[PDB]
RNA sequence: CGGUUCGGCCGGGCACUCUAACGGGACUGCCCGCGAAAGCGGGAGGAAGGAGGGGACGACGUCUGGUCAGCAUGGCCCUUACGGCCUGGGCGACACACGUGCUACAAUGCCCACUACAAAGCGAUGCCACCCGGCAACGGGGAGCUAAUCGCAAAAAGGUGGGCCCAGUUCGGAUUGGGGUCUGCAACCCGACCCCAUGAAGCCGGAAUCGCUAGUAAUCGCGGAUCAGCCAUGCCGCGGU
């Protein structure tokens, strides 16, 4: 993936105010998680994959 | 789009959880997120270690983890050298006081997470490819191992389109709570193009 | 005057390792806290099983929460210098608070 | 649904009078889904009789029944080419609830106000043949003749 | 009454008068319809146009794969066409 | 109630004949008759021309509003709709000139609401 | 000393010390013939003092607490047979004549992925 | 309607430019590139130029035209 | 039972309230008509039934459908450059076509007064009780919160009376100028929110078309998630009924 937007992580970016989550390794502020940084993209998979400190699927 | 990760559901109740520990709070942004920042590197780091189980015991700030292998006490090195240097590598990632725990891996056979290494491993360099089907499905009975049916992904050697392959024995059902099975990810480094590794074969009943 | 909780998902680790330590120190404290399970902070989570068009995928995630606490105002030397910190397992991100 | 055909719950009767024929439409007239709303709008509606009407609304009993018992109802059938509504024998069985139908209609569909005039100008309404009662009532009953043979068949 | 987009190439005059034209000869399908949409795509073996219609009566929908673009969009408001006559039966 | 311009608000209670006008509101209705000293609960006819005078002076002295404020509807507009004015702008266009859309939500001035050709091929959802 | 029964309808608790004394009750300050106002179902909540023929025998507590006040109304059927049966046991035939104590779990369903009310879909146009 | 409380923004990155049109000298014409800035009256009745995104205008401060953030006089749309 | 600045605030213990774990608990285990027999129909009955309600589950397989533009990633295309730092601008335009949703045609409602009730989460550089200004949107001293133990919120709808009597209506509320707050060295574009004025389509809407077999649909409200901010009539969850 192109790292043309990552100027911006940089510490505080401009007079300190631009901050949009994104997630991790995917880059997507549209669809992400603060609390854990993952947009629903690269981190569907892992889900149920088993990488998740007890965290398994709702249904009923 | 059908067909989930069946021991995905287990994983909670019957299955231990590989990223298990107990911390909470801020830290699943920052710490937790670092988790795979370490994972990254350590994965790729011995993955020729021959891994199967990767046990993780972050305990409160004093974090433990305890790997499986495939080579016994080999992976210690020949008496005993960079399982040091890792219980020092990590923590010039992240210093964070965690003890080094590390396992082998006893009966191969019925461990997926081992087994699918030696896939990738057969599309490193070029290796078996018609018969390397069945030329991986002998070893399997070969120690009991009920059930011989586990997924690829596609391409033959260099084809056009995904083919799958077959066979379909043993009690290794999935609509119900009553297989047991393990499986480790298994990265497929092609020359000519990347594929996936499905190994899951019955393990145990109750 | 002191102060303690408790953390973990796996409950069959959790209420284990719970005791595993608690049950140590009734040898001098007084009736001592006892086993308080508190609510459990439930986090569901989804995740779309296919982008790009048919918005028919989805399916939800989850995580259980099992916390504890404890505090034992005014403890009992022969559990103060006792326990002291043991915690071998991996579960719990305890924190001596007061 | 064809396996079973249930077996239905009876009703949980009145409370204010101890009735199931009354709370009987009052479960559809119950717009939504509030049973106090329904459980309010009679307090006035039965007083309609009590008052206007020289009767108390008690001697209104199958009052209904007697505005909505046509000859005729709507089904349906197949022959082999066409398909025509196949009207036939009529059962008290649900003329009951069908008795509450009209009800419906002929309380919305209404140039006047609020509920509390509607029932007033709707319940002396149900006799002779003044509104969309007995009116489409009626109605319904012509269709017989060119259906009306659609009788002795009864299977 | 007439939309058509396509991810390959840019709407004409020439396209829009062509459906278009054949939108205000269907009269006697004329009933119902409510914003049609028209697809056009391509592919290495020819070009494809797809077209989905909303009407009060339900939804219509059809395809079409010639070689020939114009051959292809001529295809698909046929089976509209065609559509619209076992709507009315017989 | 004719007692400025074109108001004769009429046949029922005072307290409603107060906001009762193009003009009243809440802090203009039953406030005056606080400034009056006056019960809401009053009849409009009733009031003799004796109880019209406090009203002709007290209430009637308004500031620019309702009656006369009729020199100024299009003025309060005037100085930021030609001009430059976004206004125009939405002002030199007589659009809506605060904090909106256009394409819709705002079809108060822009497009009355006679149905417009409806685009075809570009997603309308 | 005296006995007690508690009471549950729909996520919504009442507990009930019921105490000697001439019968009616109070509602933790406002006694229901200074409460609800003749609230037509709220009176319903004694059915069996009714039947019984107790009510003027007593004098209970009255505090309720969770759910919503018509789920609440309904959590004293339960506490009634929570108490008149086990201080009275007894007192137990002439209730399964009513076996009103039977709180029906017809609670608002959860809703769907999209689906409203868990059974109401939108509609849909030209097709 | 529109507010701020105090202290109207003013693009000053360029406001030091703008008042050497006063601060020793005269002259006309300045480049520029904003719509967000806001007028002062030390500084009205003077040759401006701002840009758009893509698109430059003319600019002039006058009384007629309150100098408030500008860019309410010349946004971007653009339309038949 | 004693207390009672009547407000759970005290002394106090196990019921009990939920909550937190294990076991049992509902398979019809017993009668019959039917039976050729593995079985269809009324009773017992307990918290309760007949796969309890509910989802996850989602068969090897179809459409040879679509996300390589967001990770991985065959090849091919640029290769002073389809590489790169930046201020602004379109995606909140336009003669328009309907979907998706919100909110209303009301008198069931307009507003005055008081009040009995639900799950749920979450507030570490984060949330709000109180103090006073104050039409509030709002503010400052900062207590307290890593917490069944402080807040987010005196849930909404509703209930009793009060005043209002069918007109395009104290309906609905798109809507326009002048003013205010919160985020930002900033909210023209393109902020929701407080005030002043303000007020249309619209009396159920040619056809056509959708949802569900129970706590349903329906009506009224709340939080969470994300988001620095801000405009949830979207999204997930819960309930008064």
């Known amino acids: ?60 | 789009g059908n067909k989930i990760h069946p021991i995905g559901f287990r994983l909670g109740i019957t299955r231990d959880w590989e990223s298990r520990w107990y911390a909470g709070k801020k830290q699943y942004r920052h710490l937790l997120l670092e988790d795979q920042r370490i994972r990254g590197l350590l994965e790729k780091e011995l993955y020729s270690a021959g891994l199967a189980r990767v046990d993780i015991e972050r305990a409160a700030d004093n974090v433990a983890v305890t790997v499986h292998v495939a080579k016994p006490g080999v992976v210690i090195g020949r008496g005993g050298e960079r399982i040091r240097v890792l219980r020092e590598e990590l923590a010039k990632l992240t210093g964070k006081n965690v003890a080094l725990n590390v396992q082998e891996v006893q009966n191969p056979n019925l461990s997926a997470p081992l087994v699918a290494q030696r896939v990738a491993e057969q599309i490193e360099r070029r290796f078996a490819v018609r018969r390397a089907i069945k030329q991986a499905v002998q070893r399997v009975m070969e120690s009991g191992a009920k059930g011989a049916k586990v997924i690829v992904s596609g391409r033959i050697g260099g084809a056009e389109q995904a083919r799958t392959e077959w066979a379909a024995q043993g009690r290794v059902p999935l609509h119900t709570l009553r297989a047991n099975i393990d499986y480790g990810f298994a990265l497929a480094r092609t020359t000519y193009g990347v594929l996936g590794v499905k190994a899951y074969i019955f393990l145990g009943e109750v | 005057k002191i102060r303690i909780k408790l953390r973990g998902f796996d409950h069959k680790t959790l209420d284990a390792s719970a005791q595993k330590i608690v049950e140590a120190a009734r040898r001098s404290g007084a009736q001592v806290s006892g086993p308080i399970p508190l609510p459990t902070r439930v986090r569901r989570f989804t995740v779309i099983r296919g982008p790009f068009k048919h918005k028919d995928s989805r399916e939800h995630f989850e995580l259980r929460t099992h916390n504890r606490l404890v505090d034992i105002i005014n403890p009992n030397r022969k559990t103060i210098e006792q326990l002291m910190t043991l915690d071998l397992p991996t579960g719990v991100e305890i924190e001596i608070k007061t | ?155 | ?90 | 109630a004719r007692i400025a311009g074109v108001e004769i608000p009429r046949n029922k209670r005072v307290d409603v004949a107060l906001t009762y006008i193009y003009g009243i509101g809440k802090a203009r209705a039953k406030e005056a008759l606080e400034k009056t000293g006056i019960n809401p609960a009053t009849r409009v006819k009733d009031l003799t021309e004796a109880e019209v005078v406090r009203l002709r002076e007290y209430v009637e002295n308004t500031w620019k509003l309702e009656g006369e404020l009729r020199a100024e509807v299009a003025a309060n507009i005037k100085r930021l709709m030609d001009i430059g004015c976004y206004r125009g702008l939405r002002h030199r266009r007589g659009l809506p000139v605060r904090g909106q859309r256009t394409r819709t939500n705002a079809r108060t001035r822009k497009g009355p609401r006679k149905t417009v050709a409806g685009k075809k091929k570009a997603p309308r959802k | ?127 | 309607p529109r507010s701020l409380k105090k202290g109207v923004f003013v693009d000053d990155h360029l406001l030091e430019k703008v008042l050497e049109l006063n601060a020793k000298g005269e002259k006309r014409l300045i480049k520029t590139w904003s719509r967000r800035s806001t007028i002062v009256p030390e500084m009205v009745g003077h040759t401006i130029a701002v840009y758009n995104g893509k698109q430059h205008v003319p600019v002039y401060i006058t009384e007629n035209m309150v100098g408030h953030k500008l860019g309410e006089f010349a946004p971007t749309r653009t339309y038949r």
């Open chain 5, 1 to 90: 009454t007439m939309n058509i987009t396509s991810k390959q190439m840019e709407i004409t005059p020439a396209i829009r008068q062509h459906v278009a034209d054949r939108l205000a000869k269907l009269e006697k399908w004329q009933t119902h319809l409510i914003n049609p949409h028209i697809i056009l795509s391509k592919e290495p073996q020819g070009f494809v146009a797809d077209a989905t219609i909303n009407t009060p009566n339900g939804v219509l929908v059809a395809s079409g794969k010639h070689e020939d673009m114009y051959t292809a969009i001529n295809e698909l408001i046929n089976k509209l066409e065609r559509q619209l006559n076992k709507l009315q039966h017989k």
């Open chain 1, 1 to 60: 993936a192109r790292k043309a937007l990552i100027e911006k992580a940089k510490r505080t970016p401009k007079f300190k105010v631009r901050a949009y989550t994104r997630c991790v390794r995917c880059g997507r502020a549209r669809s992400v998680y603060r609390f854990f940084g993952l947009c629903r993209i690269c981190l569907r998979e892992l889900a149920h994959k088993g990488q998740l400190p007890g965290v398994r699927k709702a249904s009923w």
């Open chain 7, 1 to 127: 000393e005296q006995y007690y029964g508690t009471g549950r309808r729909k996520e919504a608790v009442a507990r009930v010390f019921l105490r000697p004394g001439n019968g009616k009750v109070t509602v933790n300050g406002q006694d229901f013939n200074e409460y609800f106002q003749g609230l037509v179902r709220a009176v319903a909540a004694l059915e069996p003092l009714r039947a019984v023929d107790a009510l003027g025998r007593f004098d209970a507590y009255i505090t309720v607490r969770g759910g919503g006040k018509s789920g609440q109304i309904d959590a004293i059927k339960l506490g009634i047979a929570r108490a008149l049966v086990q201080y009275n046991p007894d007192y137990r035939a002439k209730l399964k004549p009513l076996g009103f104590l039977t709180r029906d779990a017809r609670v608002v369903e959860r809703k769907k992925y999209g689906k409203h009310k868990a059974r109401r879909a939108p509609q849909y146009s030209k097709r």
């Open chain 4, 1 to 155: 649904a064809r396996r079973r055909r249930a077996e239905v719950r009876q009703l949980q009767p009145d409370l204010v009078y101890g009735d199931v024929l009354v709370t009987a439409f009052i479960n559809k007239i119950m717009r939504d889904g509030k049973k106090n709303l329904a459980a309010r709008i009679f307090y006035d509606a039965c007083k309609i009789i009590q008052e206007k009407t020289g009767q108390e609304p008690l001697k209104v009993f199958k009052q209904a029944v007697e505005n909505v018992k046509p000859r005729m109802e709507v089904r349906s059938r197949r022959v082999g080419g066409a398909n025509y509504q196949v009207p036939m024998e009529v059962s008290p069985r649900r003329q009951q609830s069908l008795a509450l139908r009209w009800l419906v209609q002929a309380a919305n569909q209404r140039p006047e106000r609020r509920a509390a005039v509607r029932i007033a100008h709707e319940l002396m309404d149900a006799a002779e043949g003044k509104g969309g009662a007995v009116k489409k009532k009626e109605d319904v009953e012509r269709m017989a003749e060119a259906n009306r043979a659609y009788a002795h068949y009864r299977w």
